[PDB]
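Help wanted!
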Amino acid sequence: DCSRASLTRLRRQAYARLYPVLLVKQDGSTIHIRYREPRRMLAMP
Amino acid sequence: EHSPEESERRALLLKRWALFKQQEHEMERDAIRSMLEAQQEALEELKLESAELYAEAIKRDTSLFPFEKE
Amino acid sequence: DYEYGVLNIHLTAYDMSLAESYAQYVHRLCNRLSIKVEESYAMPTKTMLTTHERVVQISGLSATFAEIFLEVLQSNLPEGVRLSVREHTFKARPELEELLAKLN
Amino acid sequence: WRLSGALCLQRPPLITKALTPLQEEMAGLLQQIEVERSLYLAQDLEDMWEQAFLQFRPGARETEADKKNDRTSLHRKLDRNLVLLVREKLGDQDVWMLPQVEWQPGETLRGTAERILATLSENNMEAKFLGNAPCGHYKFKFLGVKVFFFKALLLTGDFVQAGKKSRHVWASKEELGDYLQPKYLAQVRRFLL
RNA sequence: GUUAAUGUAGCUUAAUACAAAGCAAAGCACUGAAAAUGCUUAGAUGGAAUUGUCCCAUAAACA
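Answered by r_m:
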C-alpha cells in the first residue's frame, strides 16, 4: 500500500529547515515535496 | 521544552503506531501468504492436470524486462 | 527451468528523502524475501531544478516470484515514485595469496 | 475432457488513498522533530498561490461520485484494483462467472489468455501478461471439465460502448462474494490482490 | 451423516514443574542501506485424554 512508506522524515544532520509544498502536475495531480522556502505549491510546465 | 504529559501522549500514540504497524505486518504477511499460497496452490493443481504446460511456463521471457510500472 | 539475471532498479523521485525511504523499505522487504542486494548506489543530481535517482541492486528472481514481487512493488510504490527495471551491464592481500597457488 | 480457460484481469488503481488520521498525527510528530533538529508581503504571494491551487482542479481520487452505479464502466473504482466479471449461462449451470473462453492444445495458455482479453470485450483494450503461470484452477463435473484462471494487468482500456448488453461488472473485492457464491468461484479472492 | 479434519501466539514434538517457555516478528534511537548495538511493543493451550486418539468447536470433499 502507498501508505506503507508514505510517512518519511529527513535523515540529514545539519540543514536549513525545509517546508512542504504541492507540485501540481500538468494533469492536475498533486504530490507533497519538501522545499527550501515556505512556498505553498509548484506548477509543472 | 516539552512537558512530561506531552511526551507521554506522544509516546502512547507511538505505542499505538508500533502495535498498529505490527498488525500491518501480520495483515500484509497474511495477505502475501494467501497470494503466495494461491500461486503455489495454482502451481500444484495444474501440474497434476498437465505438467507439460508448466514446462513451457517456467521458461522466462527475454523481452519481459526491462519492465516499467507506475 | 531458468533463473533470471541480476536486474537493477533505478528509483527516480523528486525528493531523495522519499526515495531513501522506499529504497530502504524495498531492501528490507527484499531481505525478508531473500532478495540479495549487492549495492544501493545513487546517481548524481539531474541539475539544470534537480531530481534524485537511487539504484537498489536486485539479484535473483523466479517466474512465480517475479510476478508476485513486482505487483507488491506497485502497492508499495508511494506518492509520485517512478519505478525502473533494467538488466545489469581492489582485492586484498589474503585473497591474493590463495589465488597464487591456484594459477601456479 | 472439456477444456476451458479463463482470465482474472487486474486493473491498477490510478490514485492513492488518503492518509488515515493515525498517520496524520504521526506526520505532525515527525514534522515537529524535523523542525527541532533542522538548522534554522509574503501573505499576498500565498494568496496568489493558494488560489492557483483552487483554479486548477486535481484529478479526483474517486471518479464514483457522479456514477454510483456504473458497474459496466471501466472506471468502477480508483483507490483499488478492478476485476472483469461477466455473467455466463451453461447447460446445467447458470452462475455469474469470471470471463471464460475455450482453449485447445494448439493454443498455449497465453494465446487463449490474450484472446480472453479482447473476445469478451470486443475492444482495443490494452493488458499485459507477466508470466505463463496460472493463478487458479477449478473443476465442475456433471464428463470431465476444468476452468483455468489466469492473471493479467490492464495497462489501458479503450472500452467503447460502456453500456454493453453484456453483464460485465468490474469488482475489486465487495461484489466477488455477491456474484460468485460457490467456492470454485468465491475462492477467486485467494489469488486476487 | 462418512472421510479429511485443525484444534499452546508466525514457528516448536516448549512445558505441563517451582513458568503457560524459547525463537521468529515490531517501534524508536544510532545517519550511507542492511546488520550490529541501546531503550521499548503485542500476544495463544477449542479442549481433552495419552502422549514421544479422540473431542466437540470446526470441517472441504465425500454427502
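OP: Thanks! One thing I noticed: The interface with chain B takes residues 12, 22, 25-26, 29, 108-109, 130-137, 146, 148-149, 189-191, 193 of chain D (CB under 8 Å).
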